[PDB]
Tab-separated table of C-alpha atoms and ligand atoms in Angstrom:
chain	number	residue	atom	x	y	z
A	1	UNK	CA	25.607	72.638	-7.003
A	2	UNK	CA	23.742	73.124	-3.747
A	3	UNK	CA	21.012	75.353	-2.435
A	4	UNK	CA	20.524	75.393	1.314
A	5	UNK	CA	18.488	77.531	3.758
A	6	UNK	CA	19.968	80.323	5.807
A	7	UNK	CA	18.856	81.323	9.332
A	8	UNK	CA	15.984	83.550	8.148
A	9	UNK	CA	13.227	81.411	6.618
A	10	UNK	CA	12.961	82.426	2.926
A	11	UNK	CA	16.694	83.145	2.463
A	12	UNK	CA	18.913	80.557	0.765
A	13	UNK	CA	22.561	80.152	-0.157
A	14	UNK	CA	23.374	78.701	-3.601
A	15	UNK	CA	26.891	77.343	-4.219
A	16	UNK	CA	27.471	76.677	-7.909
A	17	UNK	CA	30.157	74.555	-9.581
A	18	UNK	CA	32.952	75.747	-11.869
A	19	UNK	CA	34.111	73.483	-14.687
A	20	UNK	CA	37.634	74.715	-15.419
A	21	UNK	CA	40.107	73.751	-18.151
A	22	UNK	CA	43.030	75.415	-19.998
A	23	UNK	CA	40.595	77.604	-21.915
A	24	UNK	CA	38.893	79.151	-18.846
A	25	UNK	CA	35.791	78.155	-16.923
A	26	UNK	CA	32.138	77.353	-17.373
A	27	UNK	CA	29.661	77.904	-14.561
A	28	UNK	CA	25.942	77.339	-14.213
A	29	UNK	CA	25.252	80.439	-12.133
A	30	UNK	CA	21.458	79.998	-11.916
A	31	UNK	CA	19.308	76.942	-12.545
A	32	UNK	CA	15.488	77.149	-12.522
A	33	UNK	CA	15.425	73.341	-12.126
A	34	UNK	CA	17.601	73.626	-8.997
A	35	UNK	CA	15.403	76.365	-7.574
A	36	UNK	CA	12.202	74.394	-8.223
A	37	UNK	CA	13.769	71.389	-6.462
A	38	UNK	CA	14.638	73.444	-3.365
A	39	UNK	CA	11.675	75.861	-3.233
A	40	UNK	CA	8.710	74.066	-4.818
A	41	UNK	CA	8.377	76.727	-7.511
A	42	UNK	CA	10.326	78.398	-10.330
A	43	UNK	CA	10.490	82.117	-9.366
A	44	UNK	CA	10.816	83.178	-12.991
A	45	UNK	CA	13.101	85.934	-14.227
A	46	UNK	CA	11.299	89.134	-15.127
A	47	UNK	CA	14.433	91.295	-14.965
A	48	UNK	CA	18.195	91.045	-14.577
A	49	UNK	CA	19.751	94.101	-12.975
A	50	UNK	CA	23.400	95.005	-12.576
A	51	UNK	CA	24.690	97.482	-10.016
A	52	UNK	CA	28.215	98.904	-9.752
A	53	UNK	CA	28.923	100.442	-6.369
A	54	UNK	CA	31.708	102.573	-4.938
A	55	UNK	CA	33.397	101.294	-1.784
A	56	UNK	CA	31.192	101.606	1.296
A	57	UNK	CA	28.028	102.261	-0.729
A	58	UNK	CA	25.162	100.686	1.213
A	59	UNK	CA	22.104	99.878	-0.913
A	60	UNK	CA	19.069	98.980	1.167
A	61	UNK	CA	17.124	97.874	3.058
A	62	UNK	CA	14.697	97.498	0.131
A	63	UNK	CA	11.610	95.420	-0.479
A	64	UNK	CA	8.714	95.428	-2.976
A	65	UNK	CA	5.140	95.549	-1.675
A	66	UNK	CA	3.578	92.076	-1.269
A	67	UNK	CA	1.979	90.809	-3.445
A	68	UNK	CA	3.667	90.008	-5.674
A	69	UNK	CA	6.734	91.662	-4.201
A	70	UNK	CA	10.022	90.550	-5.845
A	71	UNK	CA	12.163	87.466	-5.179
A	72	UNK	CA	15.838	88.106	-5.822
A	73	UNK	CA	18.798	85.841	-6.764
A	74	UNK	CA	21.919	87.886	-6.068
A	75	UNK	CA	25.527	87.286	-7.010
A	76	UNK	CA	28.641	89.432	-6.752
A	77	UNK	CA	30.432	88.951	-10.100
A	78	UNK	CA	33.478	90.983	-9.195
A	79	UNK	CA	34.852	92.431	-6.032
A	80	UNK	CA	33.025	91.747	-2.767
A	81	UNK	CA	29.906	92.915	-0.947
A	82	UNK	CA	28.429	92.132	2.431
A	83	UNK	CA	24.768	91.196	1.782
A	84	UNK	CA	22.282	91.424	4.643
A	85	UNK	CA	18.830	89.830	4.526
A	86	UNK	CA	16.373	91.319	7.044
A	87	UNK	CA	13.205	89.669	8.370
A	88	UNK	CA	10.828	92.642	7.914
A	89	UNK	CA	7.727	90.365	8.206
A	90	UNK	CA	5.394	91.328	11.059
A	91	UNK	CA	4.357	88.253	13.041
A	92	UNK	CA	7.411	86.334	11.966
A	93	UNK	CA	9.086	84.307	14.766
A	94	UNK	CA	12.290	86.047	13.596
A	95	UNK	CA	10.864	89.497	12.936
A	96	UNK	CA	13.717	92.077	12.946
A	97	UNK	CA	16.389	89.352	12.686
A	98	UNK	CA	19.019	89.674	10.003
A	99	UNK	CA	21.773	87.600	8.498
A	100	UNK	CA	24.927	88.758	6.749
A	101	UNK	CA	26.527	86.772	3.943
A	102	UNK	CA	29.853	87.752	2.346
A	103	UNK	CA	29.445	87.555	-1.427
A	104	UNK	CA	33.022	87.693	-2.619
A	105	UNK	CA	33.084	85.038	-5.310
A	106	UNK	CA	30.887	84.472	-8.427
A	107	UNK	CA	30.209	80.896	-7.304
A	108	UNK	CA	28.115	81.932	-4.284
A	109	UNK	CA	24.604	83.377	-4.759
A	110	UNK	CA	21.888	84.431	-2.322
A	111	UNK	CA	18.201	83.803	-2.941
A	112	UNK	CA	15.765	86.031	-1.105
A	113	UNK	CA	12.092	85.085	-1.466
A	114	UNK	CA	9.265	87.608	-1.897
A	115	UNK	CA	8.523	89.512	1.310
A	116	UNK	CA	12.046	89.783	2.855
A	117	UNK	CA	14.264	92.872	2.989
A	118	UNK	CA	17.514	92.951	1.101
A	119	UNK	CA	20.620	95.157	1.367
A	120	UNK	CA	24.295	95.076	0.700
A	121	UNK	CA	27.421	97.168	1.240
A	122	UNK	CA	30.281	97.286	-1.281
A	123	UNK	CA	33.506	96.101	0.410
A	124	UNK	CA	35.602	96.933	-2.650
A	125	UNK	CA	35.542	99.850	-5.013
A	126	UNK	CA	33.334	99.242	-8.028
A	127	UNK	CA	31.950	95.895	-6.795
A	128	UNK	CA	29.539	94.488	-9.370
A	129	UNK	CA	26.362	92.726	-8.281
A	130	UNK	CA	23.964	91.045	-10.663
A	131	UNK	CA	20.581	90.038	-9.576
A	132	UNK	CA	17.683	88.237	-11.133
A	133	UNK	CA	14.230	89.307	-9.946
A	134	UNK	CA	10.851	87.590	-10.277
A	135	UNK	CA	9.069	90.904	-11.007
A	136	UNK	CA	10.115	94.070	-12.828
A	137	UNK	CA	11.348	96.997	-10.678
A	138	UNK	CA	8.568	99.557	-10.062
A	139	UNK	CA	9.446	102.665	-7.999
A	140	UNK	CA	5.796	102.977	-6.798
A	141	UNK	CA	5.842	99.482	-5.228
A	142	UNK	CA	9.356	99.860	-3.805
A	143	UNK	CA	9.842	100.536	-0.091
A	144	UNK	CA	12.827	101.034	2.158
A	145	UNK	CA	13.852	100.773	5.787
A	146	UNK	CA	16.858	102.718	7.071
A	147	UNK	CA	19.853	100.275	7.033
A	148	UNK	CA	21.506	101.766	10.134
A	149	UNK	CA	18.368	101.567	12.292
A	150	UNK	CA	19.529	100.473	15.818
A	151	UNK	CA	16.178	98.646	16.094
A	152	UNK	CA	17.670	96.204	13.545
A	153	UNK	CA	21.249	96.542	14.764
A	154	UNK	CA	22.911	95.225	11.617
A	155	UNK	CA	26.675	94.682	12.044
A	156	UNK	CA	27.930	96.555	8.988
A	157	UNK	CA	31.699	96.169	8.329
A	158	UNK	CA	34.125	97.578	10.803
A	159	UNK	CA	36.163	100.422	9.410
A	160	UNK	CA	34.078	101.327	6.339
A	161	UNK	CA	32.042	104.502	6.333
A	162	UNK	CA	28.598	103.799	4.807
A	163	UNK	CA	27.571	105.893	1.791
A	164	UNK	CA	23.767	106.120	1.453
A	165	UNK	CA	21.616	107.643	-1.320
A	166	UNK	CA	19.315	110.541	-0.426
A	167	UNK	CA	16.350	108.150	-0.488
A	168	UNK	CA	18.048	105.603	1.826
A	169	UNK	CA	19.181	108.397	4.193
A	170	UNK	CA	15.632	109.690	4.627
A	171	UNK	CA	14.205	106.166	4.941
A	172	UNK	CA	12.052	105.435	8.049
A	173	UNK	CA	13.055	102.969	10.764
A	174	UNK	CA	11.433	99.525	11.028
A	175	UNK	CA	9.171	100.557	13.920
A	176	UNK	CA	7.692	103.446	11.967
A	177	UNK	CA	7.102	101.290	8.898
A	178	UNK	CA	5.506	98.648	11.104
A	179	UNK	CA	2.918	100.912	12.709
A	180	UNK	CA	2.075	102.593	9.372
A	181	UNK	CA	1.235	99.139	7.911
A	182	UNK	CA	3.950	99.301	5.259
A	183	UNK	CA	5.773	96.055	6.183
A	184	UNK	CA	4.710	92.646	4.785
A	185	UNK	CA	2.719	90.354	7.078
A	186	UNK	CA	4.343	86.978	7.766
A	187	UNK	CA	1.202	84.897	7.272
A	188	UNK	CA	0.571	86.749	3.942
A	189	UNK	CA	4.161	85.902	2.938
A	190	UNK	CA	3.660	82.188	3.792
A	191	UNK	CA	0.363	82.090	1.903
A	192	UNK	CA	2.032	83.699	-1.130
A	193	UNK	CA	4.803	81.081	-1.091
A	194	UNK	CA	2.110	78.357	-0.985
A	195	UNK	CA	0.295	80.016	-3.920
A	196	UNK	CA	3.446	79.917	-6.038
A	197	UNK	CA	3.799	76.185	-5.304
A	198	UNK	CA	0.183	75.640	-6.481
A	199	UNK	CA	0.405	77.520	-9.782
A	200	UNK	CA	-0.749	75.298	-12.657
B	1	UNK	CA	16.493	100.742	-23.756
B	2	UNK	CA	16.153	99.387	-27.272
B	3	UNK	CA	15.983	96.014	-28.925
B	4	UNK	CA	16.420	95.953	-32.680
B	5	UNK	CA	16.910	93.205	-35.307
B	6	UNK	CA	20.257	92.317	-36.787
B	7	UNK	CA	20.853	91.114	-40.372
B	8	UNK	CA	20.078	87.448	-39.618
B	9	UNK	CA	16.368	87.036	-38.851
B	10	UNK	CA	16.120	85.818	-35.220
B	11	UNK	CA	19.162	87.772	-33.958
B	12	UNK	CA	18.649	91.033	-32.059
B	13	UNK	CA	20.780	93.718	-30.455
B	14	UNK	CA	19.684	95.057	-27.044
B	15	UNK	CA	21.140	98.377	-25.841
B	16	UNK	CA	20.359	98.964	-22.174
B	17	UNK	CA	20.497	102.201	-20.169
B	18	UNK	CA	22.824	103.030	-17.277
B	19	UNK	CA	21.552	105.249	-14.473
B	20	UNK	CA	24.736	106.664	-12.950
B	21	UNK	CA	25.291	108.822	-9.861
B	22	UNK	CA	28.117	109.426	-7.336
B	23	UNK	CA	27.479	106.025	-5.782
B	24	UNK	CA	27.932	103.986	-8.997
B	25	UNK	CA	25.446	102.776	-11.579
B	26	UNK	CA	22.221	100.865	-11.940
B	27	UNK	CA	21.401	99.013	-15.142
B	28	UNK	CA	18.449	96.945	-16.276
B	29	UNK	CA	20.470	94.370	-18.199
B	30	UNK	CA	17.522	92.151	-19.210
B	31	UNK	CA	13.807	92.894	-19.273
B	32	UNK	CA	11.240	90.166	-20.049
B	33	UNK	CA	8.705	92.949	-20.752
B	34	UNK	CA	11.073	94.456	-23.345
B	35	UNK	CA	11.647	91.077	-24.959
B	36	UNK	CA	7.915	90.312	-25.127
B	37	UNK	CA	7.354	93.715	-26.770
B	38	UNK	CA	9.982	93.039	-29.455
B	39	UNK	CA	9.535	89.277	-29.989
B	40	UNK	CA	5.900	88.467	-29.182
B	41	UNK	CA	6.916	86.076	-26.408
B	42	UNK	CA	8.859	85.941	-23.130
B	43	UNK	CA	11.679	83.399	-23.742
B	44	UNK	CA	11.895	82.553	-20.054
B	45	UNK	CA	15.128	81.974	-18.167
B	46	UNK	CA	15.827	78.338	-17.397
B	47	UNK	CA	19.543	78.880	-16.752
B	48	UNK	CA	22.123	81.632	-16.392
B	49	UNK	CA	25.613	80.567	-17.399
B	50	UNK	CA	28.894	82.397	-16.981
B	51	UNK	CA	31.997	81.654	-19.023
B	52	UNK	CA	35.513	83.010	-18.457
B	53	UNK	CA	37.736	82.628	-21.494
B	54	UNK	CA	41.439	83.057	-22.161
B	55	UNK	CA	42.411	85.387	-25.001
B	56	UNK	CA	41.677	83.915	-28.427
B	57	UNK	CA	39.464	81.138	-27.036
B	58	UNK	CA	36.757	80.515	-29.635
B	59	UNK	CA	33.613	78.875	-28.240
B	60	UNK	CA	31.272	77.652	-30.954
B	61	UNK	CA	29.525	77.302	-33.280
B	62	UNK	CA	26.959	75.708	-30.942
B	63	UNK	CA	23.242	75.100	-31.134
B	64	UNK	CA	20.688	72.942	-29.280
B	65	UNK	CA	18.494	70.545	-31.261
B	66	UNK	CA	15.124	72.072	-32.248
B	67	UNK	CA	12.695	71.750	-30.547
B	68	UNK	CA	12.903	73.299	-28.095
B	69	UNK	CA	16.494	74.272	-28.782
B	70	UNK	CA	17.747	77.176	-26.603
B	71	UNK	CA	17.320	80.936	-27.068
B	72	UNK	CA	20.231	82.895	-25.648
B	73	UNK	CA	20.615	86.479	-24.312
B	74	UNK	CA	24.351	87.140	-24.199
B	75	UNK	CA	26.318	89.940	-22.600
B	76	UNK	CA	30.029	90.487	-22.054
B	77	UNK	CA	30.301	91.781	-18.462
B	78	UNK	CA	34.017	92.418	-18.570
B	79	UNK	CA	36.608	92.534	-21.266
B	80	UNK	CA	35.507	92.063	-24.875
B	81	UNK	CA	34.447	89.246	-27.188
B	82	UNK	CA	33.551	89.092	-30.846
B	83	UNK	CA	30.190	87.258	-31.024
B	84	UNK	CA	29.155	85.641	-34.301
B	85	UNK	CA	25.605	84.472	-35.009
B	86	UNK	CA	25.373	81.922	-37.844
B	87	UNK	CA	22.278	81.101	-39.909
B	88	UNK	CA	22.504	77.279	-39.707
B	89	UNK	CA	18.825	76.880	-40.798
B	90	UNK	CA	18.394	74.827	-43.977
B	91	UNK	CA	15.982	76.541	-46.366
B	92	UNK	CA	16.639	79.925	-44.853
B	93	UNK	CA	17.025	82.765	-47.410
B	94	UNK	CA	20.238	83.556	-45.483
B	95	UNK	CA	21.420	80.010	-44.852
B	96	UNK	CA	25.189	80.043	-44.081
B	97	UNK	CA	25.195	83.825	-43.505
B	98	UNK	CA	26.739	85.150	-40.331
B	99	UNK	CA	26.992	88.410	-38.471
B	100	UNK	CA	29.659	89.549	-36.035
B	101	UNK	CA	28.890	91.863	-33.132
B	102	UNK	CA	31.590	93.261	-30.824
B	103	UNK	CA	30.407	92.829	-27.239
B	104	UNK	CA	32.799	95.048	-25.343
B	105	UNK	CA	30.510	96.823	-22.915
B	106	UNK	CA	27.940	95.508	-20.359
B	107	UNK	CA	25.271	97.764	-21.877
B	108	UNK	CA	25.092	95.831	-25.166
B	109	UNK	CA	23.479	92.364	-25.294
B	110	UNK	CA	22.753	89.952	-28.137
B	111	UNK	CA	19.586	87.876	-28.326
B	112	UNK	CA	19.731	84.743	-30.433
B	113	UNK	CA	16.412	82.931	-30.895
B	114	UNK	CA	16.021	79.137	-30.844
B	115	UNK	CA	17.424	77.495	-33.973
B	116	UNK	CA	20.419	79.796	-34.749
B	117	UNK	CA	24.106	79.037	-34.188
B	118	UNK	CA	26.086	81.021	-31.683
B	119	UNK	CA	29.833	81.520	-31.141
B	120	UNK	CA	32.254	84.006	-29.755
B	121	UNK	CA	35.994	84.623	-29.486
B	122	UNK	CA	37.595	86.265	-26.439
B	123	UNK	CA	39.426	89.445	-27.533
B	124	UNK	CA	40.860	90.006	-24.058
B	125	UNK	CA	42.309	87.637	-21.530
B	126	UNK	CA	39.723	86.353	-19.080
B	127	UNK	CA	36.730	87.974	-20.830
B	128	UNK	CA	33.551	87.174	-18.915
B	129	UNK	CA	30.325	86.410	-20.758
B	130	UNK	CA	27.008	85.836	-19.050
B	131	UNK	CA	24.146	84.379	-20.873
B	132	UNK	CA	20.559	83.621	-20.080
B	133	UNK	CA	19.069	80.601	-21.851
B	134	UNK	CA	15.444	79.555	-22.345
B	135	UNK	CA	16.268	75.862	-21.728
B	136	UNK	CA	18.779	74.100	-19.488
B	137	UNK	CA	22.064	72.955	-21.105
B	138	UNK	CA	21.941	69.250	-22.063
B	139	UNK	CA	25.078	67.726	-23.653
B	140	UNK	CA	22.939	65.130	-25.536
B	141	UNK	CA	20.930	67.851	-27.338
B	142	UNK	CA	23.967	70.058	-27.989
B	143	UNK	CA	25.517	70.185	-31.462
B	144	UNK	CA	28.426	72.012	-33.017
B	145	UNK	CA	29.709	73.184	-36.374
B	146	UNK	CA	33.414	73.887	-36.866
B	147	UNK	CA	33.885	77.697	-36.420
B	148	UNK	CA	36.690	77.965	-38.995
B	149	UNK	CA	34.763	76.166	-41.751
B	150	UNK	CA	35.559	78.033	-45.046
B	151	UNK	CA	32.003	77.134	-46.136
B	152	UNK	CA	30.901	79.730	-43.541
B	153	UNK	CA	33.915	81.993	-43.982
B	154	UNK	CA	33.573	83.831	-40.680
B	155	UNK	CA	35.965	86.803	-40.381
B	156	UNK	CA	37.503	86.032	-36.996
B	157	UNK	CA	39.786	88.806	-35.623
B	158	UNK	CA	42.958	89.606	-37.437
B	159	UNK	CA	46.043	88.783	-35.441
B	160	UNK	CA	44.554	86.468	-32.791
B	161	UNK	CA	45.250	82.764	-32.943
B	162	UNK	CA	42.022	80.835	-32.203
B	163	UNK	CA	42.098	78.366	-29.300
B	164	UNK	CA	39.482	75.605	-29.718
B	165	UNK	CA	38.424	72.816	-27.323
B	166	UNK	CA	38.926	69.208	-28.429
B	167	UNK	CA	35.195	68.956	-29.157
B	168	UNK	CA	35.148	72.156	-31.277
B	169	UNK	CA	38.315	71.058	-33.136
B	170	UNK	CA	36.756	67.750	-34.173
B	171	UNK	CA	33.428	69.398	-35.048
B	172	UNK	CA	32.032	68.728	-38.574
B	173	UNK	CA	31.628	71.431	-41.219
B	174	UNK	CA	28.206	72.884	-42.077
B	175	UNK	CA	27.879	70.830	-45.274
B	176	UNK	CA	28.384	67.558	-43.436
B	177	UNK	CA	25.892	68.498	-40.730
B	178	UNK	CA	23.421	69.535	-43.416
B	179	UNK	CA	23.435	66.255	-45.325
B	180	UNK	CA	23.298	64.187	-42.102
B	181	UNK	CA	20.077	66.039	-41.121
B	182	UNK	CA	21.578	67.541	-37.971
B	183	UNK	CA	20.869	71.226	-38.764
B	184	UNK	CA	17.532	72.899	-37.885
B	185	UNK	CA	15.035	73.419	-40.707
B	186	UNK	CA	14.049	77.047	-41.319
B	187	UNK	CA	10.315	76.416	-41.636
B	188	UNK	CA	10.445	74.367	-38.366
B	189	UNK	CA	12.220	77.331	-36.729
B	190	UNK	CA	9.530	79.785	-37.959
B	191	UNK	CA	6.742	77.483	-36.787
B	192	UNK	CA	8.402	77.187	-33.362
B	193	UNK	CA	8.610	80.980	-33.050
B	194	UNK	CA	4.882	81.171	-33.913
B	195	UNK	CA	4.121	78.496	-31.281
B	196	UNK	CA	5.864	80.525	-28.587
B	197	UNK	CA	3.745	83.560	-29.529
B	198	UNK	CA	0.573	81.427	-29.152
B	199	UNK	CA	1.333	79.934	-25.735
B	200	UNK	CA	-1.565	80.558	-23.338
C	301	CA	CA1	36.901	86.928	-4.856
C	302	CA	CA1	34.586	98.048	-22.438
């Protein structure tokens, strides 16, 4: 199994191996040892969440306030979603950049470190996503940026009408969140990553 | 969400809540905070494994050598399995007892602490089980007892022919493992549980 960086620093793609035989398959979907080798730290699992989404449901762009924010390891267990990581970190060389990854097989997982924005859209009806998070979900620490903001310009799938929740529909754009001081700061994100590597 | 003990000390049933709306559902499938409240410790997640099994495939009865053995939080994400926890602990008041739980919905999960034996049979073709484990899988520390041993007398489902791997077919019975000193000791299991509660 491999874990390699994506184009936004802090996002990683994990490709995991299937051992198959006549009885079915075994897969190591998540390995703390593999993550510590790639990242320098074990993110820990405080919560595992599962979300079932109707086709075209767009969940995002969400992030937890830093610190400690939430790091996420995301896998689509059935069906397919288009996952988009967004660099919401002010002062980042790639601030406002995004990258889309198709998660359409259980052997591909996305790791998003603390301080990045995460989103996905369900490409199939009732797509199931599981995600491990380093910190428990807390509504009070949870923030959102509108996923269709033209200031981000995410290329959501052609031909699928997005379905947003009330909360995601009324979410501010990135430029509003920026000037209100509600986005993470890139140097604070880097220092947090270094702190995790030093724990002990 | 609730987490309550089963009939074998060390096995627990977790029932988790679904928040459903027109867009799908959100579920908190695993909560370290909930586990620490029930158990006195956070087991930690070293690995998440996923197994797909043909109908009638019987995986088990498996256990990792104590210590540190492996604690397992098991959920059937799709289809149905019959999970059987076995009290393999010599000196236990319930040594050789077992309990079957039908895992046929993603909102029910079984927690098996370090030192118990775990098994399941797939009731549907291609049933998918995910499980979180406190320690990484290591073949050298992994042991097995034959799941059809009449000395355990597990009531596997009526009308389904069991399909075992070569390794599970050639697995010894519980009485052989006992006299060869390959089963966990109940007082060692209890002392290990107390050690986890004292860590810090
Ligand atoms: Ca697929
Ligand atoms: Ca069901």
